[PDB]
């Protein structure tokens, strides 16, 4: 959900465009994305797992497993795998529109609000 989001619809923010420059732009859409972080038995992980992928618990109905809980999941190859559940992360993603009417989907970490202090790297590439 948008619970805890720190950017509002209609907010002016700064982000990098397709062309490499940073511009003001307005937020026109907002969404949340919940992914789980699981540790496979070969030592690898995924922090992009769809909650629906968990087959040892109905996570859509019941919410996430407990941290550290052993789970089973169905991967995108259609096969079942054991893993350790680590955490659930809900992140907010925004759609922005630039002056020219072009649009981009942007993760919160790639947005600057107008109050934040901007990197020198960024101030250098900021269009008027
Ligand atoms: Cl693999």
Report resolution (Å) to 1 decimal. 1.7
Ligand 1 center from residue 60 Cα (angstroms): 25
One fold for 12-32+90-123 and 34-89: no
d(CA 34, CA 7): 17
Residue-range domain boundaries for the chain = 12-32+90-123, 34-89
Q: How far apart are the first and last CA of the chain?
A: 34
* CATH fold label, 12-32+90-123: SH3 type barrels. (2.30.30)
Q: Which two tokens stand for residue 5?
A: 């989001």
Ligand 1 center from residue 81 Cα (angstroms): 10
Q: What are phi and psi of 79, to 5 degrees?
A: -100, 160
d(CA 8, CA 12): 9
Those residues with Cβ within 8 angstroms of residue 60's Cβ, 6 or more apart along the chain or in another chain:
51, 52
Q: What is the Rg, in whole angstroms, of the alpha carbon atoms belonging to the chain? A: 19
List the Cα angle 119/12/35 in 5-degree steps: 80
* CATH fold label, 34-89: Vcp-like ATPase; Chain A, domain 2 (3.10.330)
Residue with tokens 């909650």: 51
Ligand 1 center from residue 119 Cα (angstroms): 38
Catalogue the E-assigned strands of 1-128: 12-16, 22-40, 45-49, 70-74, 80-97, 103-107, 111-112
Closest residue by Cα to residue 14 from 102, 115, 92: 115
Give the three-state DSSP class for 61: helix
Ligand 1 center from residue 46 Cα (angstroms): 10
Ligand 1 center from residue 41 Cα (angstroms): 10
């Amino acid at each position: 959900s948008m619970l805890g989001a720190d950017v509002s619809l209609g907010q002016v923010v700064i982000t990098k465009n397709r062309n490499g420059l940073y511009y003001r732009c307005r937020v026109i859409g907002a969404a949340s994305q919940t992914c789980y972080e699981v540790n496979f038995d070969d030592g690898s992980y995924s922090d992009n797992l769809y909650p629906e992928s968990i087959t040892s618990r109905d996570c859509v109905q019941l919410g996430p497993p407990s941290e550290g809980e052993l789970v089973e999941l169905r991967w995108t190859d259609g096969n079942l795998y054991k893993a350790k559940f680590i955490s659930s992360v809900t992140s907010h993603i925004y759609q922005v529109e630039f002056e020219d009417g072009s649009q981009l989907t942007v993760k919160r970490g790639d947005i600057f609000t107008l109050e934040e202090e901007l990197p020198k790297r960024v101030r250098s590439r900021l269009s008027l």
